[PDB]
C-alpha cells in the first residue's frame, strides 16, 4: 500500500540495535522499531562522506 523510508546516519557497532525487539541506546531513545516490524534494514559504512 505504501513504503516509508527512514534515513539516518548511525555509529557502527550500535547498528545492530536497529531490529525488532532490540534493546539498546539507539533502540531505546532514538529509533524504536515495533516488535512486529515488517520491512528491511539497509546500512553501509559512510566514513568517506
Amino acid at each position: 500500500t505504501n513504503v516509508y523510508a527512514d534515513s539516518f546516519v548511525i555509529r557502527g557497532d550500535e547498528v545492530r540495535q536497529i531490529a525488532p525487539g532490540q534493546t539498546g541506546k539507539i533502540a531505546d531513545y532514538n529509533y524504536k522499531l515495533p516488535d512486529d516490524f515488517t520491512g528491511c534494514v539497509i546500512a553501509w559504512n559512510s566514513n568517506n562522506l
Binding site: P20, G21, T23, D35
Partner: protein, 49 residues
C-alpha cells in the same frame, strides 16, 4: 511478566498458553464423556421411575 521484556516474555507466555489450553481442552473432553455417561444413567433412572 516482571522478569522479562515483552519480546522475551512472549515466547514463555506462548508455551504456558499452549499447555493450559491443552489441559483445559482435555478437561472439557473428559467432562463431555462423563456427561454422556451420566445422561445414559439419568435416562435409565427416568425409565425406572
Amino acid at each position: 511478566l516482571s522478569r522479562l521484556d515483552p519480546p522475551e516474555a512472549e515466547v514463555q507466555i506462548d508455551r504456558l498458553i499452549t499447555g493450559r489450553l491443552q489441559s483445559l481442552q482435555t478437561y472439557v473432553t473428559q467432562q463431555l464423556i462423563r456427561a454422556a455417561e451420566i445422561r445414559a444413567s439419568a435416562n435409565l433412572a427416568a425409565t425406572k421411575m
